[PDB]
Design an enzyme around this catalytic site. Structure first.
Site, mmCIF file in Angstrom:
data_model
loop_
_atom_site.group_PDB
_atom_site.id
_atom_site.type_symbol
_atom_site.label_atom_id
_atom_site.label_comp_id
_atom_site.label_asym_id
_atom_site.label_seq_id
_atom_site.Cartn_x
_atom_site.Cartn_y
_atom_site.Cartn_z
ATOM 1 N N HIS B 135 117.965 -7.780 -26.765
ATOM 2 C CA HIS B 135 117.364 -10.071 -25.885
ATOM 3 C C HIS B 135 116.087 -10.523 -26.590
ATOM 4 O O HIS B 135 116.016 -11.769 -26.325
ATOM 5 C CB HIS B 135 118.273 -9.555 -24.971
ATOM 6 C CG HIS B 135 119.979 -9.962 -25.250
ATOM 7 N ND1 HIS B 135 120.590 -10.331 -26.385
ATOM 8 C CD2 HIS B 135 120.491 -8.783 -24.167
ATOM 9 C CE1 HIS B 135 121.632 -10.047 -25.680
ATOM 10 N NE2 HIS B 135 122.023 -9.221 -24.372
ATOM 11 N N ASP B 168 125.205 -4.279 -35.276
ATOM 12 C CA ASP B 168 124.335 -4.529 -33.498
ATOM 13 C C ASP B 168 126.094 -4.421 -33.108
ATOM 14 O O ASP B 168 126.716 -5.557 -33.288
ATOM 15 C CB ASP B 168 123.804 -5.679 -33.614
ATOM 16 C CG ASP B 168 123.381 -5.748 -31.961
ATOM 17 O OD1 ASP B 168 124.097 -5.562 -31.181
ATOM 18 O OD2 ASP B 168 122.384 -6.206 -32.099
ATOM 19 N N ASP B 170 126.761 -3.919 -30.355
ATOM 20 C CA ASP B 170 126.710 -4.261 -28.507
ATOM 21 C C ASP B 170 127.681 -5.119 -28.656
ATOM 22 O O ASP B 170 127.941 -6.331 -29.562
ATOM 23 C CB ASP B 170 124.935 -4.571 -28.315
ATOM 24 C CG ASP B 170 125.306 -4.814 -26.492
ATOM 25 O OD1 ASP B 170 125.291 -6.496 -26.510
ATOM 26 O OD2 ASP B 170 124.447 -4.259 -26.150
ATOM 27 N N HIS B 172 127.420 -7.962 -27.346
ATOM 28 C CA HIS B 172 126.271 -9.131 -26.984
ATOM 29 C C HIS B 172 125.413 -10.126 -28.361
ATOM 30 O O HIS B 172 125.616 -8.391 -28.581
ATOM 31 C CB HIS B 172 125.406 -9.399 -25.813
ATOM 32 C CG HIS B 172 126.445 -9.216 -24.533
ATOM 33 N ND1 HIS B 172 125.745 -7.529 -24.276
ATOM 34 C CD2 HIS B 172 126.428 -10.200 -23.813
ATOM 35 C CE1 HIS B 172 126.888 -7.845 -22.933
ATOM 36 N NE2 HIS B 172 127.144 -9.943 -23.316
HETATM 37 CA CA LIG Z 1 126.869 -7.280 -31.336
HETATM 38 ZN ZN LIG Z 2 124.918 -5.900 -24.660
#
Ligand SMILES: [Ca+2]
Ligand SMILES: [Zn+2]
Ligand SMILES: Nc1ccc(-c2ccco2)cc1NC(=O)c1ccc(-c2cn(CS(=O)(=O)c3ccccc3)nn2)cc1
Ligand SMILES: Nc1ccc(-c2ccco2)cc1NC(=O)c1ccc(-c2cn(CS(=O)(=O)c3ccccc3)nn2)cc1
Ligand SMILES: Nc1ccc(-c2ccco2)cc1NC(=O)c1ccc(-c2cn(CS(=O)(=O)c3ccccc3)nn2)cc1
Ligand SMILES: [Ca+2]
Ligand SMILES: [Ca+2]
Ligand SMILES: [Ca+2]
Ligand SMILES: [Ca+2]
Ligand SMILES: [Ca+2]
Ligand SMILES: [Zn+2]
Ligand SMILES: [Zn+2]
Lengths: 367, 368, 367
Positions: B135, B168, B170, B172
């Site tokens: 992030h 990715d 994750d 998020h």
């Molecule tokens: Ca992700």
């Molecule tokens: Zn995350």
């Protein structure tokens, strides 16, 4: 006996894919002329399909793809190069004059047929200009631009809880399979050549997903399958599907590119062997929509679909062809039935038995 | 066949503390390491201690002003920096803690060292579980992350590789990585993540990149409750098509474990086997691969997940019975490696997953 | 182009009637999010409704009833057991948290719209949170608490001598018909299922009283009416009403419980057949207030009111749904338009024409 409605628009034979393209819509006009000369018109009702509207096609296909098919023309391709790449139109699925109307006529007959089965106005509906099984929601594929089969099945689903689609074109019916891959309300069963062959899908392991797990069935074959090997797998598989799935309507794609001598196909079936599939499906006495499909040796497509129309009608027709507008095309023998070739059948008994046993295992997983 | 795996770990990482009640616990990296030592995975791989990445290294991406602030700010001088803390988004979610800059240097040093080893063809795979801070932005902290080790490692890869694929998993959206590469075709970013009223708020499937980067960002938005079957049925087909169309020569896989069932902050329902199937899929392509950590807030499951993903990278079957280790009591009450999914509802129907997949395949057609 | 203003409060979708209750205010939030993702915000003025005050609500409702709605809470229900009985709150019209503010937000959008129409600041005003046509002067009924329609019509009647009310919810709009049953300044026209069905009123023979004789019009229908059949009586009825009554303002209640597949309703209209009603009313070019109403299959409520908003804006929108916050609710097809079911239409052609003829007789009795 059983009532048969048949769809034909006399313009369909005029559409032209372009020089050297193997797809020849003329084959439908040849088919129709041969069957009229055998007198099968006295035995069925013949209807000219209404053109399917663009709105009807967007029941399944994306608006932007249908708007593109309605807009593109040989003379405007330069302004649409990014859309051509997006929708896979331009090469194997060329832009030709009247493309969109060709889509409307092919689709029109299949949907009309479904409507007539839903209304119980007929037992069997036939549309040889249909069977465009490769088209996707927003992509042309394999010479097919609009998926008339999916749109006819969506129409059957208004009145039938379970619909069974069976596909004996040599290619995997991937557009139809993908449309219904996560539902149990349509079971798709495809027999096809598999392995370094278009379109590349239809593995034994592709059995559906979600609520549709076990309701997609694929029987991948190698080159050279013949009438006896094919009919010995077709009847037991479809029997078991009928028993386990209990559909209330059936759609049969009768692509003739699985015939011996096909220009693009590698199978060794005869007209009798191909039509054996139709006879088998008929014995279950369910509302039936019979559609065309692939087929590149056009004299053999005409014989195949003529004989399959006679099977539909429960009519024995002579082997000697009646005189017709295309008579010279059928020389030098002028017979209805064809001989297999001496090509090697690469499907071993062990291979066929192993596949069949896995499919029986999968069919036992149904409710 | 089997790969050379280089693994980065600093024994100090576990001592960094975000502060009372903060859900990010760098101690989970020490748990992971201890568990994997106790399974004997150290016999099979080369274990290296990351260097401390320098300001020169971090400013290959981040602003000199931001990195100077990160080097300067301390719990004892906070009150003098009230203005800058606002500017750079430090002080709440991304707190000032003792040794903040050093934690950034260690996280980053492992990812960048791994990218170098890959560039030099000294390893087939490099693993840095302390990394994956997706992030962080060019001049701002975000989502517990301060320095974007991923963007820095990809920049190192781009010295030897024309195209790099970032993936990715994750929970998020990997927004800092997507933003850094949003206008280029030399990195394709593919993020699978929860979308709708959830941090960080980006990653709509209609975000596809811009300029030369248009079509080289791929976002798969998901709802609560996704499970192993649902995930596994879209991940292999999307990654296979991306590989086919983009033909990368290196890959960076962020393996954030906040997508597991039971995560304190996340809302998905994946098991360790479901999450690790992603690693196994990406491995089959036989490309140089950098595997990084990411989020993950139920620390016993984070340790399980990353231990098993290490064993996967090594092609090594490990027993479900957990070996004794320094953190053994955290794995009760079962003391097993694998976890069960919860009974939570999966809000992602099989039709929704196929529909989103179909929409992303239309965008992948637009690659040249 | 005619101007459209639209009212929505972002808190509306959070009010909850309680577990198992079929009315789901969340459907309004789904509608709003679909029309935002279609891009339709660019084409209209979007306003947040004010919270209507007790002063506005008592233009119709009794002081005692409004005071009770303002007071009643899940935590003080024990103390109000007799008032709950008197005002018919607590069962099908439950007490829930924020009830009064829910009423204020729904009413505020309808009255605010009518104020905009009276001031000639817009040609059309839309409030999908409104349309609560069953509420009575002093009691709740049918999931409705405050009759925002009656209050909006009282607002319109400040500036307009004659106002026409049209109601295509599947239920008779009894609270509105009752409010105006003895006046000729509002003509109420309801099409609805009739025969052992909620609310039990709306017989063909209920035609108004006193100065309002002939200014109430009811078209009672049976299960399974379809788009073809509905549209064949709606256009002629509405055209005759417009010719004979000559209203200067129109209020259209667009309840979506008349759609095929509704959890509580028994009709077979599609989104297109329901929205044709909006298209017809629009051809008269009168100030128009469009309101929501029932609808219990919430994915189809969102489709219907999104498409009707597009109709108000004279904008065709594609059948392919855009991605949105609730995209999974629109499977399996993710299209805007819906198909009818195979349910039997119990309304014969002769029945429709006969009832039409009876209403045309009543309409000829106007000045
Ligand atoms: Ca992700
Ligand atoms: Zn995350
Ligand atoms: N299966 C099928 C069924 C119906 C229709 C149809 C189109 C119009 C009316 O009916 C077309 C097909 N398509 C093929 O048979 C096909 C043959 C060959 C390649 C290929 C591609 N590359 N090499 N071979 C693709 C596809
Ligand atoms: N995705 C991720 C990946 C790596 C790291 C990381 C940090 C340090 C080392 O690795 C941190 C994250 N961040 C989150 O998981 C996160 C969770 C929750 C909120 C939030 C903020 N407000 N509500 N929820 C923000 C962010
Ligand atoms: N028509 C209508 C119009 C608007 C609203 C409204 C409420 C809140 C916001 O908008 C509610 C309704 N009510 C019904 O559709 C209804 C359905 C069914 C029964 C029933 C009662 N007993 N059996 N069926 C009553 C009523
Ligand atoms: Ca086939
Ligand atoms: Ca299926
Ligand atoms: Ca990019
Ligand atoms: Ca009504
Ligand atoms: Ca009246
Ligand atoms: Zn074929
Ligand atoms: Zn209603």
């Amino acid at each position: 006996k059983k009532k048969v409605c048949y769809y034909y628009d006399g313009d369909i034979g005029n559409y032209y894919y372009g020089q050297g393209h193997p797809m020849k819509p003329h084959r439908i006009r040849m088919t129709h002329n041969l069957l009229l000369n055998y007198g099968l018109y006295r035995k069925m009702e013949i209807y000219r399909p209404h053109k399917a509207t663009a709105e009807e096609m967007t029941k399944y296909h994306s608006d932007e793809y249908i708007k593109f098919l309605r807009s593109i023309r040989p003379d405007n391709m330069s302004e649409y190069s990014k859309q051509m790449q997006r929708f896979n139109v331009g090469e194997d699925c060329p832009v030709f004059d009247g493309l969109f109307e060709f889509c409307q006529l092919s689709t029109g007959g299949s949907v009309a047929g479904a409507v007539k089965l839903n209304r119980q106005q007929t037992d069997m509906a036939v549309n040889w200009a249909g069977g465009l099984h490769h088209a996707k929601k927003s992509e042309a594929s394999g010479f097919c631009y609009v998926n008339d089969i999916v749109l006819a099945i969506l129409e059957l689903l208004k009145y039938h809880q379970r619909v069974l689609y069976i596909d004996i074109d040599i290619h995997h019916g991937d557009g139809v399979e993908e449309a219904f891959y996560t539902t149990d309300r349509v079971m798709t069963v495809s027999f096809h050549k598999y392995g370094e062959y278009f379109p590349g899908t239809g593995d034994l392991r592709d059995i559906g997903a979600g609520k549709g797990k076990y309701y997609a069935v694929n029987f991948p074959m190698r080159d050279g399958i013949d009438d006896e090997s094919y009919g010995q797998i077709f009847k037991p598989i479809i029997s078991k599907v009928m028993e386990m799935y209990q559909p209330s309507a059936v759609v049969l794609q009768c692509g003739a590119d699985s015939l011996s001598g096909d220009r693009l196909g590698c199978f060794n079936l005869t007209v009798k062997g191909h039509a054996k599939c139709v006879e088998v499906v008929k014995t279950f006495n369910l509302p039936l929509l019979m559609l065309g499909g692939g087929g590149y040796t056009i004299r053999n497509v005409a014989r195949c679909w003529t004989y399959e129309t006679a099977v539909a009608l429960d009519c024995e027709i002579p082997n000697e062809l009646p005189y017709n507008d295309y008579f010279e095309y059928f020389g030098p023998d002028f017979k209805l039935h064809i001989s297999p070739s001496n090509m090697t059948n690469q499907n071993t008994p062990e291979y066929m038995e192993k596949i069949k046993q896995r499919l029986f295992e999968n069919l036992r997983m149904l409710p």
